[PDB]
Design a protein around this ligand. Structure first.
Ligand SMILES: [Cu+2]
Ligand SMILES: [Cu+2]
Ligand SMILES: [Cu+2]
Ligand SMILES: [Cu+2]
Ligand SMILES: [Cu+2]
Ligand SMILES: [Cu+2]
Ligand SMILES: [Cu+2]
Ligand SMILES: [Cu+2]
Ligand SMILES: [Cu+2]
Ligand SMILES: [Cu+2]
Ligand SMILES: [Cu+2]
Ligand SMILES: [Cu+2]
Ligand SMILES: [O-]
Ligand SMILES: [O-]
Ligand SMILES: [O-]
Lengths: 278, 278, 277
């Protein structure tokens, strides 16, 4: 493999995050005050890293930070129950850890932390974050295994109830690549509804990475995946591979949902920047 | 293996398809005028084949042909957006390609096209084919990999909203086999609802082919599979294997749906044609 | 050096009953007056045969239908096939299981092993809608030779808007000690899709919930979408890499967790304490 690959992890990383009310009523996380986003910033680490997040709640309501998949002690689970959320104006330091796979003492195999995960609030609106999640307090987390192929770019598509990334119906988001780019998608679902994520012209493996290790990988190859609240998966595709440049739709394939606006464009451009038929 | 297996592909195939309005209000694809069906005809090809489909819309409304999984250029995605649908009475030649898996230049592994896929309209009723799909404009596509086991017969079961293959509730379809037949199922979902596909007395591997390569295949073995709009999977079973002849129900396991008629019979006969207790 | 399942092949016998419960529910049991919701766990090894002398103590027809395992049409528990059981009746269902192996044609036959379940098929409707709603469901585990055996198994069933037919916001809760090998059988029933989530723990989305080793492509997850009659299972090391604590599990459909589909996986330190509880 002469594509770029993830290094062995084991760093201790530090990071500041904030939760802000947005002018429009939404709420979002951010690495800097005044720079919050929905989805929140992507956090990306290598198996074995430790991540210390100094999180500061700048809102008038209790808020928290709960993560999927990664190792964390009960003091960092972000629930009111475990006294793990954050009062208005407060600051708390969450710790997320990750480990590599390996043999246990009993001889069994411990799974690694690697995968496409996500983080979200657990105390805004209800003790389960129904309010925070609806408002935009969610973001992606990627834990890489040594040797994983690194992409050219990562995009995050969150089906949040009847919206993509809390956007107005029929307003995307759209993404751009050039034929040949290694594009990574992180795909998260939140809220009340099941969906099916479909991409025109591209396909991926329904496994941890979206990629087949080689000819022995029995994983199904798909272009349509059902998902429900808090499901997270990801994959890599070579933009336009075997199909060429184009305005390639992605969307929920629940007919009413796509009719109502859960559609976006994967805009794959020729080297001259053009998109056939757009 | 002394079962029949798929050959290496790489032929250029040519096909004529039509969309027709049916007397009863439904819409269907067909290989000949007046011989349309719901589901539409099964297209089956080998990885590496190219398929040129001269498609003619015999209806009074615009209609199109959109396919999952297979390779196609933006001019064949069958969307209005890309000027890819077909005006009433028009004729257009869609091209679908397929490829085998293999090493890329960067050392990574390109997935092959092989799988259980499907095609459907994209412009009847809405820019997403909600009307076409609901009227019956969907059909199965099978792309086989060199060495895949070939079945004795293939049946197609489509959960379209509250119906199987657009049939009236409680009217099947029923299928028939003789104990020992290698029966292939293509299972496709369409519309607004999630379902769970269950088959009594039989089970399959939840992977690309429904079959375990051998003792190292970690794939879950199941008899119940959740599916959402535009999901497609398939599998093979040995009719009556380890269970004998019988009228074996298949159905959606969502209690209300099976109660409302999403039920059918896998009628597995003894060599004398009889079904115990039917 | 963990305990592993033996090769199967025993012929097992078992009595089961269906009872109406005082509160209106219905449940299976191995003994009259000892029925549960979920019903008792049945566990066997690939190759075992299981003869269940089922007696219906209810005033309505009831039956016993199982997923995954081998059974003849006479044991499929449907009214259609004349294999349900009249009130007060007794019928002997036979479930069989086989190991994997090469067929005559050279193909590979899948084994019966997995996380399965049984439920009624004739109470309320010809599909058990009433039986299932009332509590007539339980788990079945078929083990493959060599499978890791757990310290304890718990069964979590998402039945419509309930866990194990319990009032919203009443668990069930489960207890382990940091380090225990805890097995979960997770079954869904009724009308709704759910997503099962556990705080602080994860598993492999394959047959066993465990990775055989480095070459297992299976996704590791902590959220699984699930629909009526879906069954999966897994083992976790309680508190592994996360420590003791009151770890929530719940449906992650926001409204469902708000409405009460929540429970606690109470992982204790060796002194019995739970930080923050
Ligand atoms: Cu939670
Ligand atoms: Cu949707
Ligand atoms: Cu498509
Ligand atoms: Cu969550
Ligand atoms: Cu589309
Ligand atoms: Cu259904
Ligand atoms: Cu069944
Ligand atoms: Cu489609
Ligand atoms: Cu059934
Ligand atoms: Cu739920
Ligand atoms: Cu969580
Ligand atoms: Cu069932
Ligand atoms: O589509
Ligand atoms: O069933
Ligand atoms: O959560």
């Amino acid at each position: 493999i002469t594509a770029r690959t993830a290094p062995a992890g084991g760093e201790v990383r530090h990071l500041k995050m904030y939760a802000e009310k947005l002018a429009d009523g939404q709420m979002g996380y951010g690495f800097e005050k005044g720079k919050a986003s929905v989805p929140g910033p992507l956090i990306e680490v290598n198996e074995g890293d430790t991540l210390h997040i100094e999180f500061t709640n700048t809102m008038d309501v209790r808020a928290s930070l709960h993560v999927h998949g990664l190792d964390y002690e009960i003091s960092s689970d972000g629930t009111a129950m475990n006294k793990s959320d954050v009062e208005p104006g407060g600051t708390r330091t969450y710790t997320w850890r990750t480990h590599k796979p390996g043999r246990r003492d009993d001889g069994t195999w411990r799974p690694g932390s690697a995968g496409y995960w996500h983080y979200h609030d657990h105390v805004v609106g209800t003790e389960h974050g129904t309010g925070g999640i609806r408002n935009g307090l969610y973001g992606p987390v990627i834990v890489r295994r040594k040797g994983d192929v690194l992409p050219d770019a990562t995009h995050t598509i969150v089906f949040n109830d009847m919206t993509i990334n809390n956007r107005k119906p029929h307003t995307g988001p759209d993404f751009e690549a050039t034929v040949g780019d290694r594009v990574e998608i992180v795909m998260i679902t939140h809220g009340e509804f099941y969906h099916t994520f479909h991409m025109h012209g591209h396909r991926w493996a329904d496994n941890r990475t979206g990629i087949l290790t080689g000819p022995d990988d029995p994983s199904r190859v798909i272009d349509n995946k059902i998902t429900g609240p808090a499901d997270s998966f990801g994959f890599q595709i070579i933009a336009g591979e075997g199909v060429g440049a184009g305005a390639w739709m992605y969307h929920c394939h629940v007919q009413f949902h796509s009719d109502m606006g859960m559609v976006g464009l994967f805009l794959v451009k020729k080297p001259d920047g053009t998109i056939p038929g757009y």
